[PDB]
């Protein structure tokens, strides 16, 4: 599993209504762009969940890297992104072969979302719209960008 | 050397003087660039070639088909040491892998110069290295790409 975590003052997420309208909004918090690998297991997901929730990305009391999202009662917007498995190693056109197929990915993603809300709180976890074109107006704070690939630890 | 490339409709970059705008792009890419203490010129040339050549926009009916240069779009290069934020140990990132600020700035300035030489002086915008930045961004897709050059054989 791969995640890019960005620290924000706000994020406004919107989709097409045409078959843009705002479907989700956060203030202070994190936006987490999350890629599900075809071989991901529950263990991968748990590690990402723990890290997003516990990473000390805010300053407190004139001390750096001190507080996490839960501490400050901040929000998280979770956005599904298969582009992180974009192989850029060959030429100009990225391929996305490492990504989990969208049907499996969706149920996996929903499970992750539920697990997020379980360790924190239902009101503090916002999502986008798996499989849909999205527009996200984001106020980047710092900016602070953290990358994690689970294929590198335990 | 590490980079997070995001596809944008626009990005407005602001620093504390309260917030003065120093830099603005419409359509293009924002690149969050982290320089590693052992990075060579070759690592840079690989990132530059990729930000410039990767086919990240669709083109009516065709998917992942056009790059930033094809479309005559812009690039906002933003210096980011948080990409060397190691989060494997505790929950406080450490940044020992990141090249020291003055050497980093010198290297970053060269990188900007080579971007301009490979594309166009007018099309490459930057942040304020070493400074707190606020970045109002409109993510388009979203599309997020991560590259680490120590994962490939130059
Ligand atoms: N493996 C996956 N991990 C995370 N999200 C996934 C994965 N597979 C599918 N998705 C979801 O399905 C969408 C389109 O396939 C994924 N969407 C995206 O990555 C962005 N909306 C960008 C995008 C850009 C172009 C395009 O043709 C499709 C999507 C994600 O919401
Ligand atoms: N090795 C480096 N690679 C890229 N940028 C670097 C590097 N070293 C220093 N910088 C620049 O100097 C700042 C502090 O080191 C870096 N700033 C940032 O990464 C963002 N403003 C995030 C931030 C936010 C707060 C803070 O106290 C430090 C950093 C970067 O612009």
Numbering used by the authors:
A (entry chain A): 1 to 19, 27 to 161
B (entry chain B): 1 to 17, 26 to 162
Question: What do the authors report?
Answer:
PfDTD was co-crystallized with a post-transfer substrate analog D-Tyr3AA, which mimics D-tyrosine attached to the 3′-OH of the terminal adenosine (A76) of tRNA. The ester linkage between amino acid and adenosine is replaced by an amide linkage to make it non-hydrolyzable. Similar post-transfer substrate analogs have been used extensively to study proofreading mechanisms in atomic details for both Class I-specific CP1 editing domains and Class II-specific editing domains.The crystal structure of PfDTD in complex with D-Tyr3AA has been solved in two different crystal forms: crystal form I at a resolution of 1.86 Å in C2 space group and crystal form II at a resolution of 2.2 Å in P21 space group. Crystal forms I and II have two and eight copies per asymmetric unit, respectively. This provides us with 10 independent observations of the ligand in the active site. The superimposition of all the copies of ligand from both the crystal forms I and II shows considerable deviations in only the side chain atoms beyond Cβ. The lack of recognition of side chain atoms indicates that residues with different side chain chemistries and sizes are treated alike. Such a side chain-free recognition mechanism provides the basis for how nature has designed a single deacylase to deal with any D-aa-tRNA and reveals the crucial role played by weak hydrogen bonds in D-chirality selection. Therefore, the key to identifying the mechanism, as seen from this study, is the capturing of the D-Tyr3AA ligand that is bound in the actual substrate-binding pocket.
However, a freestanding enzyme D-aminoacyl-tRNA deacylase (DTD) removes D-amino acids (D-aas) mischarged on tRNAs and ensures that D-aas do not get incorporated into proteins. Mechanistically, the most remarkable challenge that DTD faces is to specifically act on multiple D-aa-tRNAs while rejecting L-aminoacyl-tRNAs (L-aa-tRNAs) without any specificity for either the amino acid or the tRNA. The enzyme is a symmetric dimer with two active sites per dimer that are located at the dimeric interface. A mechanistically unique solution to the problem of enantioselectivity employing two carbonyl oxygens from a ‘cross-subunit’ Gly-cisPro dipeptide has been shown to be responsible for D-chirality selection and strict L-chirality rejection from the active site of DTD.
